[PDB]
Amino acid sequence: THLLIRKLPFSRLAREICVKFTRGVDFNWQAQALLALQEAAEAFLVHLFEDAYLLTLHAGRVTLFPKDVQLARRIRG
Amino acid sequence: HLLIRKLPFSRLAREICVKFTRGVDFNWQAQALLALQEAAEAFLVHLFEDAYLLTLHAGRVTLFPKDVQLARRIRG
Amino acid sequence: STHLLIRKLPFSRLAREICVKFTRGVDFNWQAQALLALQEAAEAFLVHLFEDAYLLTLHAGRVTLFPKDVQLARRIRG
Amino acid sequence: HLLIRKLPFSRLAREICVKFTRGVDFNWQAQALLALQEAAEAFLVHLFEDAYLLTLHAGRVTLFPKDVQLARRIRG
Amino acid sequence: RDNIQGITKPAIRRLARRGGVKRISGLIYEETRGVLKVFLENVIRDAVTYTEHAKRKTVTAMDVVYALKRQGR
Amino acid sequence: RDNIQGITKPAIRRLARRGGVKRISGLIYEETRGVLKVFLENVIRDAVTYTEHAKRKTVTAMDVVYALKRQGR
Amino acid sequence: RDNIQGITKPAIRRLARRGGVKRISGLIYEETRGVLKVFLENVIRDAVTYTEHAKRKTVTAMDVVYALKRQGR
Amino acid sequence: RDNIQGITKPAIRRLARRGGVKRISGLIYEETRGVLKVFLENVIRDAVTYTEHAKRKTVTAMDVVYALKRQGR
DNA sequence: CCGGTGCCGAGGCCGCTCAATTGGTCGTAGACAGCTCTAGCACCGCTTAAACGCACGTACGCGCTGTCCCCCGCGTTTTAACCGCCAAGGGGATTACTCCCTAGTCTCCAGGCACGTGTCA
DNA sequence: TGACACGTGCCTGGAGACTAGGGAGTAATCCCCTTGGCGGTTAAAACGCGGGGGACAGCGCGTACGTGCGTTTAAGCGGTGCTAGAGCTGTCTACGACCAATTGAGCGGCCTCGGCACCGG
């Protein structure tokens, strides 16, 4: 249940996107906030991989492709 | 522009209403029956479209039931 | 995963016996497709119950399923 | 006779209503708020006794969050 | 006949044509019928509940619209 | 022999394997048999009621489907 | 203060006492608050939908009863 | 380096391992990075709106929770 | 009208897994064919959408009434937040143990079939 | 009256039961620190009187508004027999692309400090 993405790169990326949305104005991020955001992104990516692997096993192939994730996203909506 | 015949779908909708109302048969307005039939049509068409997206992905031309089932599983 | 895990003839025998028990001596013709559907459903329910009971067994330190691990699962589920 | 206070739960229910009404807040009939609070407290009590069934079976005496989570998973 | 069977095979084929599918397996019709029944069951259950809330005996178009809203996205 | 014993130990083991369990206590088989019997009793009771409602003497697949619907979720 | 914290720790402790639990972890309170919020969200959403169906501006006890029926068993 | 590249290939592989996948194409990493960026953009946008609505300079955990609620189911 | 909380940047250490390179191998897209199954042509039944009257249950809008929601004060009130002491226990480690995992073999049977027989709306 | 289920019979591989082997997860225990439970306290949000104000739910009634029906029909539509051909699936193959493993090391995480940004009692 631990994070598999290291906390500092993900913190960098999150702060970068918050910078983009705020025209560069820096809104400080609490530790629990970044922790929850990383938890949610991790869970979302894991569920997307379980869906893309459902696609892959439906296609008979054993390896994910750039296609099985795009199709999982398209079908999920 | 209804693809399913009107009276069979009316029969089925009233059957299910009798199921859920425990014996009491509600008067179904024609507007309600058409809205329900249009919604069911659109839902089935979208499900077929997603199932064909699955089947073409799996290197086939005929959609089997297992990919309608997989589409339903993915959509949630 | 789809193939039936229980032998068809003993389960059909048990289904017919339980059918006799309720109507008190009336033998109903049991359509073979009804037997197949009932067996599919019974096996699916059993597999799901074992899944939840193993979720309960994983909670405690043990790795082996017990009777109470199923009884508590049935009590919690309903 | 309810354990949770009337006014905090009232305020929380009103906030959750505003969430789902796009900012317009409906007047809550006091009897409706009372019934909702009774239902919430009964659900919480049942969840707690299920979680204690789970934790007693785990060899422990103190309730844990994972106990409630597993109870929620098993129930549905 | 059974009442679910009134939604005939050519109707499912036409719906599938509108969905853009070119070829159709024989078992899909039966599966589709089951799926449709499930959908209808859910929607109609909600519609009837709304009808009971409105203290009416006639399911209205608004009942169906609310059922569909609360059922599908 | 008793009729419940025809569902042998390896069948319950295979069902348990499909349920993802790695190890199995000796008493579970007996308990599981009881559980299954209870389930069957309920489902079959509902199926038979439907059969009597349909004024038939042959339990159909639809009878079982309705029993399962009205019994489990 | 935030509004979810108004359901104080001793209230959750009392609910737990009614549930028969003798000892309580510090984190359960936070988790319970989340669970309760989820429950309320669902129930209130359904209640408000019913209110809109009735063309009313006041949520009534009947709205809540119907929401509870359609949400929990 | 680019800041999006700090989420290295082994991290995506580990997430995929948790997702149960046995083999991984070389291009998936790039696609996954794009997908993740999109997700983060959406969530963070909502979080910041909540923060600006409260007229504060600190993104709290509750802001993130609200963003997640309003973004995913 | 200043203040406690928290982030950004920096100095600096460990640590531990990141990238690359090797080998092994594998599994999958293309090709090829038997099968099969299916979309369509053509016939014949069929049953359904709309049109007549026809009566009729009742949905909805309008109006009147009360009635409880929202509001605040406010006296009380009572118990939540906090702190500190007491002690129950979660669990990590330790030691014993016993009973269920493999599994080959002797033995029972599932069912595929082939048949005959009785049964019901 | 015609399609569908129930009891006999074979047998052949497919499966059920036993014990030989054993080891590894299951059961009982100690203490160490953690961390809930309880004694004191006060005030700060809760909760009933009480005026008060009224927006709005609930109920009654009229009216036409849409439901269900008797009956047709015919004509577009459905069930079906047969057919030609196009795809599913079973199988061979071979080669680009993956997984395991080790080695230099490069960035994360913990440790700590200087600096300010800021809604707020």
Segment (H or E) for A5: none
Q: Say how far apart CA C65 and CA G25 lie, in whole Å.
A: 27
3-class secondary structure, B27: strand
The 3-class SS string of C37-72 reads: HHHHHHHHHHHHHHHHHHHHHHHCCCCEECHHHHHH
3-class secondary structure, G27: coil
Two structure tokens written together for B50: 């997603």
Q: Say how far apart CA H67 and CA H64 lie, in whole Å.
A: 5
* CA E45 to chain CA centroid, nearest Å: 12
Task: Say which residue the tokens 């988790």 belong to.
Answer: G31
Contacts of F70 (CB under 8 A, 6+ apart): F46
Q: Say how far apart CA E34 and CA F28 lie, in whole Å.
A: 35
Q: Say how far apart CA A50 and CA H19 lie, in whole Å.
A: 5
Measured between beta carbons, the chain B residues lying within 8 angstroms of A75 are 50, 53-54, 71, 74-75
Angle, CA of D54, D57 and D63, to the nearest 5°: 50
Method used to determine the 3D structure: cryo-EM
Interface test mutation site (partner G, options D1, D3, D57, D66, max chain G beta carbons within 10 A): D3
Q: Say how far apart CA G19 and CA E10 lie, in whole Å.
A: 57
Residue E15 identity (one-letter amino acid): L
Going by beta carbons, is chain F in contact with chain H, meaning 3 or more pairs sit under 8 Å apart? Answer: no
Segment (H or E) for E24: strand E23-24
Q: Say how far apart CA C1 and CA B57 lie, in whole Å.
A: 23
> Within a 10 A sphere around the Cβ of F66, how many other Cβ atoms?
19
Q: What is the CATH number of the domain that holds A32?
A: 1.10.20.10
Question: What is the phi/psi pair of residue G23, to 5°?
Answer: -135, 150
In chain F, the N- to C-terminal Cα span, in Å, equals: 35
Q: Say how far apart CA A14 and CA D34 lie, in whole Å.
A: 43
**A75/B contact by beta carbon, under 8 A:** yes
Q: Say how far apart CA H42 and CA H65 lie, in whole Å.
A: 13
CB contact under 8 A, A71 and B50: no
Judge whether B25 and B10 are in contact, CB under 8 Å: no
Q: Say how far apart CA E5 and CA D60 lie, in whole Å.
A: 56
Q: What is the CATH number of the domain that holds F52?
A: 1.10.20.10
Q: E54 to chain B nearest CA, in Å?
A: 13
Where are any strands of DSSP class E within chain F?
Answer: 23-24, 58-59
Judge whether G47 and D26 are in contact, CB under 8 Å: no
Contacts of C38 (CB under 8 A, 6+ apart): C15, F40, F43, F44, F47, F64
Closest CA to F1 of C39, C29, C34, C17: C17
- Number of domains composing chain A: 1
Q: Say how far apart CA A47 and CA E32 lie, in whole Å.
A: 27
Judge whether D40 and G72 are in contact, CB under 8 Å: no
- Number of domains composing chain F: 1
DSSP G12-48: HHHHHHHTT-SEE-TTHHHHHHHHHHHHHHHHHHHHH
Residues 17-56 of B with CB under 8 A from A: 50, 53-54
Q: Say how far apart CA C60 and CA D4 lie, in whole Å.
A: 32
Q: Say how far apart CA A15 and CA A28 lie, in whole Å.
A: 8
Residues 39-68 of F with CB under 7 A from strand J: 58
Which nucleotide, over all strands, has the C1' atom closest to the CA of C34?
Answer: J5
Q: How far is CA D15 from each of CA D11, D21, D26, D35, rounded to the nearest angstrom?
A: 6, 10, 11, 17
Residue A35 identity (one-letter amino acid): L
Range of the domain at A25: 1-77
Of F20, F39, F58, the CB nearest to C31: F58
Range of the domain at E11: 1-73
Measured between beta carbons, the chain B residues lying within 8 angstroms of A68 are 57
Q: How far is CA E3 from each of CA B7, B8, E6, G5, rounded to the nearest angstrom?
A: 11, 8, 6, 54
The reply to whether G3 has its C-beta less than 7 Å from any atom of strand J is no
Segment (H or E) for C25: none
* F24 DSSP β-pair partners: C65
Contacts of A60 (CB under 8 A, 6+ apart): B58, B59
Strand I, nucleotides < 7 Å from a protein CB: these are: 6-8, 17-19, 27-29, 37-39, 47-50, 57-60, 68-70, 79-81, 88-91, 99-101, 109-111, 119-121
Task: Say which residue the tokens 């948790």 belong to.
Answer: H18
Residue G66 identity (one-letter amino acid): Y
Query: D3 CA to I96 C1', in Å?
Result: 49
In chain A, the N- to C-terminal Cα span, in Å, equals: 27
In chain D, the N- to C-terminal Cα span, in Å, equals: 29
Residues 41-70 of G with CB under 8 A from D: 41, 43-45, 47-48, 51, 56-61, 63-65, 68
Q: Say how far apart CA E7 and CA A29 lie, in whole Å.
A: 57
**E31/B contact by beta carbon, under 8 A:** yes
Judge whether E7 and E36 are in contact, CB under 8 Å: yes
3-class secondary structure, F23: strand
Give me the sign of the Cα torsion angle D75, F19, D64, G8: negative
